[PDB]
Ligand binder design. Structure first.
Ligand SMILES: Nc1ncnc2c1ncn2[C@@H]1O[C@H](COP(=O)(O)OP(=O)(O)OP(=O)(O)O)[C@@H](O)[C@H]1O
Lengths: 106, 420, 149
């Protein structure tokens, strides 16, 4: 299980200090030798570390928006998609919001 | 000594991560550490709580929000480190260096080395943490600036007792990704979930609102003998939950925005509390329907203008959105969403004359109204410095939206809608 | 034959459509609405053109897990049921109260006793979906009221 993480890390990027930067939290978080014996074998904490490393990218920010925010984002993306330059403004986004709500109600 | 872990909810990974990089041994703690989280993610609160949970630590707090630029940033570091070292070890006889002489980072290194030399006689190595909250919030910032703070520890004499263990907090993510190859131990903060925001605001503002003067005035007025602090908290929690469920889509999962709605609507909501609304939140909500149907975040015949001013504005809106091609086609007897275009003074005057209800001509009052329009920020120009209207290179554009000009035309009884 | 109130309902719904074209609807579409209401009643035993038939004709011309139509059908019923007690001032409705009422409204459409529990569970899931969409607001019984939206 630990060698699984080691191989995945190797195949992703080959800077050893970067892997050490993840090993150190695992060792420091360990509370006692008796718990360390169980923790080091399965080693599920590196997954938590990796997901924390990715928690503020586009996916992490997109996962937290509300329904209205997401709908306005979808409308703006639609405006950009229909645009050759891919640009949009607030007026067009709100007009597409109005049209989509009218269609949904209709 | 061993660090004790705080009990901060909705952050029970980062509070454990901080115990990994911060310890009593200066030979263990890394030279740099960055905590990343957007506005309202709890970074400052969590870090301050962690430091307050372990008083034996030693730290310096600065805010680049107050420290506008990097020169104050260094000067405050020097001054506060000097003061803190005097406070921690008054017994040691030491001298002073001017904190106002720091002009370049090398001078900071020089002053820090000179100060640390004085404390060379210390019994053991000392771990010092410098905390800069919101590093990317600095008003004058550049990419090369942050590199100067990463590789600074190794310019010190490595045998010195005083070791500086910098701590930074960052808001954005386009900032941190520029420094990925440095592999700085980084701790992350995600945006709070809706349930998390709801729980946090209840935990925070309940005691703030249970003791406001308005409610205890209204309780006396309404003679509520059976009111208890437990029911007071329940009323406050109902208020907060109602605002959250009514305005989460309006504010998002943002703590700061919801707090201000809770503050504003609180007096008006209190005004509807009576003897009948003590035990039925549904009835109070029914009475307060008009408060929830409107955000009321608005700061509040919308623009009092002369007839000449109104017609000038009507003509200017036509100029800023109608092609020059169609002027002779429409006005001579011979688009809703884009940004407005520029127009010349003669086009505006000609359209104004064509639409004004025998010629009106151009008198001093017309130009005076036109200048008033500019002064009122209804018409914009193409210049920003040394305003000179008579310069032949300045053009004009409309700053008034459609929703206002529609009502202006309605008040004028002029049918703009048929010109497009 | 058109009912007397159907005339007012028809002119209101015609103004509603005419507002939306500020193709474009003309009076031929009003005659078409009358004609489609006539046709729908023509497929039924009653000559009285009730406002429901005109509503159906309006929907058919204006529109130009669980399935879409079955889900959306329950939404109008539940919203109207809650707005009813809103006007009456009666006691507010819980989830169970809405589910039982909705099952009573469709007693004749159920196929089997086994489908009873299936439709009850589907109704609860639809209620949860509506709450997630914030068309119904939960207040404290677990009280459901019309959302401020
Ligand atoms: N787990 C929590 N428990 C209680 N209160 C919390 C929690 N997390 C955050 N808060 C509250 O949220 C507030 C958010 O402000 P905070 O100090 O985090 O600002 P910031 O994000 O660092 O600032 P800036 O956006 O200006 O850079 C805190 O002051 C705190 O009162």
């Amino acid at each position: 299980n630990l060698n699984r993480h080691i191989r995945m890390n190797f195949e992703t990027f080959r800077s050893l200090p970067t892997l050490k930067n993840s090993i150190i939290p695992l060792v420091a978080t360990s509370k006692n030798f008796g718990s360390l014996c169980t923790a080091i074998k399965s080693c599920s904490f590196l997954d938590i570390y990796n997901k924390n490393q990715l928690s503020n990218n586009l996916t992490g920010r997109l996962q937290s928006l509300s329904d209205l925010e997401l709908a306005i984002l979808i409308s703006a993306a639609r405006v950009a998609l229909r645009a050759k330059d891919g640009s949009f403004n607030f007026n067009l986004a709100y007009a597409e919001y109005e049209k989509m709500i009218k269609a949904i109600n209709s | 000594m061993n660090v004790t872990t705080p009990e901060v909810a909705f952050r029970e990974y980062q509070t454990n991560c901080l115990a990994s990089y911060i310890s009593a041994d200066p030979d263990i703690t890394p030279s740099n550490l960055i905590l990343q989280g957007y506005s309202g993610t709890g970074k400052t609160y969590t870090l301050k709580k962690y430091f307050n949970a372990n008083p034996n630590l030693h730290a310096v707090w600065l805010e680049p929000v107050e420290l506008v630029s990097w020169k104050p940033l260094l000067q405050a570091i020097a001054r506060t480190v000097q003061y803190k070292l005097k406070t921690l070890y008054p017994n040691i006889p030491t001298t002073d260096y001017d904190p106002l002489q720091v002009e370049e980072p090398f001078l900071l290194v020089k002053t820090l080395h000179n100060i640390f030399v004085q404390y060379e006689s210390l019994q053991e190595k000392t771990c010092l943490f410098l905390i800069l909250d919101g590093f990317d919030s600095l008003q004058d910032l550049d990419a090369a600036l942050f590199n100067k703070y990463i590789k600074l520890n190794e310019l010190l004499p490595k045998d010195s007792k005083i070791n500086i263990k910098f701590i930074y907090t960052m808001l954005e993510t386009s900032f941190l990704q520029r420094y990925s190859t440095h592999c700085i131990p980084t701790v992350m903060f995600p945006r709070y979930n809706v349930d998390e925001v709801s729980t946090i605001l209840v935990m925070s503002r309940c005691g703030e609102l249970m003791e406001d003067s308005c409610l205890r005035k209204r309780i006396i007025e309404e003679q509520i003998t059976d009111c208890t602090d437990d029911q007071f908290q329940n009323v406050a929690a109902n208020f907060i939950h109602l605002i959250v469920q009514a305005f989460h889509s309006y504010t998002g999962n943002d703590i700061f925005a919801l707090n201000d709605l809770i503050d504003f609507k609180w007096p008006k909501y209190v005004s509807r509390i009576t003897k009948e609304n003590i035990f039925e939140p549904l009835a109070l909500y029914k009475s307060a329907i008009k408060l929830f149907l409107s955000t009321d975040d608005n700061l509040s015949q919308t623009y009092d203008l002369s007839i000449i001013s109104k017609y000038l504005l009507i003509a200017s809106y036509i100029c800023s959105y109608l092609e020059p091609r169609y002027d002779a086609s429409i006005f001579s007897r011979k688009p809703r969403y884009l940004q407005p275009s520029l127009f010349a003074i003669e086009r505006l005057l000609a359209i104004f004359q064509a639409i004004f209800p025998s010629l009106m001509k151009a008198n001093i009052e017309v130009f005076q109204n036109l200048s008033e329009l500019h002064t009122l920020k209804l018409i914009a120009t193409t210049m920003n410095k040394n305003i000179d209207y008579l310069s032949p290179k300045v053009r004009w554009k409309v700053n008034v939206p459609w929703e206002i000009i529609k009502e202006i035309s309605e008040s004028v009884h002029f049918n703009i809608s048929d010109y497009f | 034959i058109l009912t007397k109130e159907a005339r007012s309902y028809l002119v209101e719904k015609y103004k509603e459509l005419r507002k939306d074209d500020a193709y474009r609807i003309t009076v031929r579409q009003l005659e078409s609405m009358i004609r489609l209401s006539e046709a729908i009643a023509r497929a039924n035993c009653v000559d009285e053109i009730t406002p429901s038939f005109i509503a159906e004709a309006y929907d058919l011309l204006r529109q130009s897990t669980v399935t879409y139509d079955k889900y959306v059908s329950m939404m109008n019923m539940i919203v109207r049921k809650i707005a009813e007690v809103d006007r009456e001032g009666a006691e507010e409705l819980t989830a169970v109260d809405i589910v039982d009422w909705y099952l009573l409204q469709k007693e004749n459409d159920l196929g089997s006793l086994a489908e009873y529990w299936e439709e009850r569970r589907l109704a609860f899931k639809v209620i949860k979906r509506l709450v997630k969409d914030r068309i119904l607001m939960e207040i404290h019984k677990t009280v459901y009221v019309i959302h401020p939206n």
